[PDB]
């Protein structure tokens, strides 16, 4: 019945934070127009 | 529980520190991209000059 920890909320926040990166990547790709917009993406594709 | 609290605080601070490395990497990557563009234009100029 514990209210000093609401672990369900922690799981939900973890999932939202996980989705955040994908959402940001999708927006960045849509705005820029290039799938390799940084070295973190491929960087072998970036070098070539 | 005291040890658990210490570990939780340390790990949260560690993630906060980790974000800084990503920030530094992004800044340096942007600067390097600008250097890349300058080098590409220099190469084009040399191809024109030779």
């Amino acid at each position: 019945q514990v209210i000093n920890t609401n672990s369900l909320s922690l799981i939900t926040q973890n999932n939202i934070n996980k989705n955040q990166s994908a959402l940001s990547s999708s927006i960045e790709r849509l705005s820029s127009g290039l799938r390799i917009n940084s070295a973190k993406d491929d960087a072998a594709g970036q070098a070539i | 529980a005291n040890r658990f609290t210490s570990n939780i605080k340390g790990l949260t601070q560690a993630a906060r520190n980790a974000n800084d490395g990503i920030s530094v990497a992004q800044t340096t990557e942007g600067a390097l991209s600008e250097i890349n563009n300058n080098l590409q234009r220099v190469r084009e100029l040399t191809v024109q000059a030779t």
């Binding site: - | 920030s23 992004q26 800044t27 942007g30 600008e34 563009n37």
Partner: protein, 43 residues
């Protein structure tokens, strides 16, 4: 005035030098602006 066309040619080259330097400075400043924008966003 002796050798007039040579005088005109060197004058034209001398103004072209200044124009080219000015354009190079323009490109310099534009690249600086873009890098500053990226750095500001990251900060």
């Amino acid at each position: 005035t002796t050798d007039p066309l040579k005088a005109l040619d060197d004058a034209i080259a001398s103004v072209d030098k200044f124009r080219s330097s000015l354009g190079a400075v323009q490109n310099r400043l534009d690249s600086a602006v873009t890098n500053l924008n990226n750095t500001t966003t990251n900060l």
